[PDB]
Amino acid sequence: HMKTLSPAVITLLWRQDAAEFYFSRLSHLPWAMLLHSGYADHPYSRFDIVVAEPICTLTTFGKETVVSESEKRTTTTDDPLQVLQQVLDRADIRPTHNEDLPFQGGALGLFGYDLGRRFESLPEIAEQDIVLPDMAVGIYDWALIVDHQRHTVSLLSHNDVNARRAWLESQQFSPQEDFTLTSDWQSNMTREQYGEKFRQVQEYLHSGDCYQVNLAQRFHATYSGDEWQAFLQLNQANRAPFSAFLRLEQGAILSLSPERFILCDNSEIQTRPIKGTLPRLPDPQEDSKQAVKLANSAKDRAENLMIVDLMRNDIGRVAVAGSVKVPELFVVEPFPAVHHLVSTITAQLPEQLHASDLLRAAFPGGSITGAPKVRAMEIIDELEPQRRNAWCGSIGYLSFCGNMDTSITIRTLTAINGQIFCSAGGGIVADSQEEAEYQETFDKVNRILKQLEK
Amino acid sequence: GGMILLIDNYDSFTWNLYQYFCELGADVLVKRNDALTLADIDALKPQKIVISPGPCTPDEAGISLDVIRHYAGRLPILGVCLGHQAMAQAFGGKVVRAAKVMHGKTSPITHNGEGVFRGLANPLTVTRYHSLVVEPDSLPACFDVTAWSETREIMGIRHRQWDLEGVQFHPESILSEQGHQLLANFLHR
Ligand SMILES: N[C@@H](Cc1c[nH]c2ccccc12)C(=O)O
Ligand SMILES: [Cl-]
Ligand SMILES: [Cl-]
Ligand SMILES: [Cl-]
Ligand SMILES: [Cl-]
Ligand SMILES: [Mg+2]
Ligand SMILES: [Zn+2]
């Protein structure tokens, strides 16, 4: 459109902690956002991204999206991702791809699970008890990129990168009162109530309604103090490559997600569904054995491939011709709490589509709903007491260049007016067993939950 | 040099089939079962026709049965899962409950190396998503069974005179072996 020129870049001083160091001073500002690769040794852990002070914001509650510019505020009932794509286009910033700068400004933030209700007709049984947007995205004409591969810190801006450097260096950090939990963790279900729901799900798998359902429970506690101090210590401990801290108008999202939803890099699509998890074991001899048990488990390989078939279909609707490939299956990825079974699907985005169109076609993830997707979601809404909200949605960016990357917000806390929420699920098949799957949820978030207990 | 018509019967993995056919270089037109009439097909002039899987019965599969009756002996037709059951029923076969529920289990099937199994490995590991089979005792004489489950359920049929063949399982699925070569047989026979 008007600006095809590449953004002005300024290299700052390399330090491994550059993102946490610069973001500390912004952590309290609504629309201040960090994507952090968790300092992980991982093939998909290279970049930390820092934004704040958006030129434009989008907030979706139910059927309304509010688009707020400097003074202008509009409300619309239109498809939220169509509204987002219109706002990106209207910014008139169109740079070429840069493999070193994957986000060159553009949209960044949260697509909550219940945004999916805008793309599929679903029942309204589950209770909506958290007021936080289904979509909370800022448009940024600058960013700070920390590249752990090249050991580079880049400050880019489409306006005045020099003023932004100064604006950033001028901000200073008065460490806020420390985070404490002011109650014990408490589930939204008894172990009895889990069972009643676990049995009801398997009853639905026998009818052959569906093949797989992710069933989740939610823990709540009261907290006081600064959520940013909590994040610093969780980020250290979780080494998760799709980690994020979002400061929203309504509260904070602390994502320690290890899962990538969809990457769109120079039109090359990649999704890495996690399906299959075994807990990590103390003895280093017995833990190397878990990695092989998990890789070689027929029940777990079957469940994963079901989800690969689902993701192949979601991506295949919109992918180019015969581009949908499955280059890698059942790689085991070790994380502090758990070993995960990860498969990767690749494809090509057609030049007629946008990453936003790809995201609409696939959202929310097959890995955290089930198969068929619509029936899995119908059941989840029927049996889970409360809506998932920010949990099992996606955090990510849509660059002005066309690129995108997103997470699944598993291992993700919502902190809102003194209440903190943490959810844990698990794929359920006819073959799987009640107590194993109940205990699987605990194994997934115990280190998170207990690290905050003091 | 011919377009393939894929009749969508609203399966969850319909685009997996479209993509497999696209990988093999096929020009595929995807139309849904209630979005097409037999007259419309005549004007699109397809070279081959595929009847996709689906959750419904052959009766509730829009024009699926209509297409088999009208195009049998004029164009090659492949049926997958529902399309296979519709194919059987159109010639007077019956559909029945399977032995057990087959929700994304894989299973080995033995075959005779005929039709879409020409050149393929024996046995073959394939995935079934659905829990209905063609009744063997009812199967019309015009069909040979091309493959069997471990349980002796029908996993494939081929018409003895015309180019029309059905498979009960999902070749488009990544859990299923030589899906590509299977559909390439149908495409280039
Ligand atoms: N790990 C990603 C960047 C990233 C970190 N956390 C994220 C959260 C959501 C999306 C992307 C990210 C990369 O190296 O490119
Ligand atoms: Cl899982
Ligand atoms: Cl192997
Ligand atoms: Cl491949
Ligand atoms: Cl989880
Ligand atoms: Mg599992
Ligand atoms: Zn089937």
Residue numbers in the entry:
A (entry chain DDD): 0 to 453
B (entry chain AAA): -1 to 187
Quote the original article.
PabB catalyzes the amination of chorismate (Cho) to 4-amino-4-deoxy-chorismate, which is a committed step in folic acid biosynthesis. GATs comprise minimally a glutaminase that produces ammonia, which reacts with a synthase-bound substrate to yield specific nitrogen-containing products. As evidenced by analytical gel filtration and isothermal titration calorimetry (ITC) data, the PabA and PabB subunits form a heterodimeric assembly with a dissociation constant KD = 0.16 ± 0.06 μM.
The resulting data allowed assigning the bound metal ion as Zn2+ that fits well with the predicted coordination geometry. As Zn2+ was not added at any stage during purification and crystallization, the most plausible explanation for its presence is its extraction from the expression host. Comparison of the glutaminase active site geometry in the presence and absence of Zn2+ allowed to identify conformational changes associated with Zn2+ binding. While we did not detect any significant positional changes for the catalytic triad residues aC79, aH168, and aE170, the side chain of aH128 flips from an orientation blocking the PabA active site in the presence of Zn2+ to a conformation, in which it integrates into an interaction network forming the glutaminase active site in a catalytically competent conformation, in the absence of Zn2+. However, our biochemical data did not reveal any effect of Zn2+ on ADCS activity.
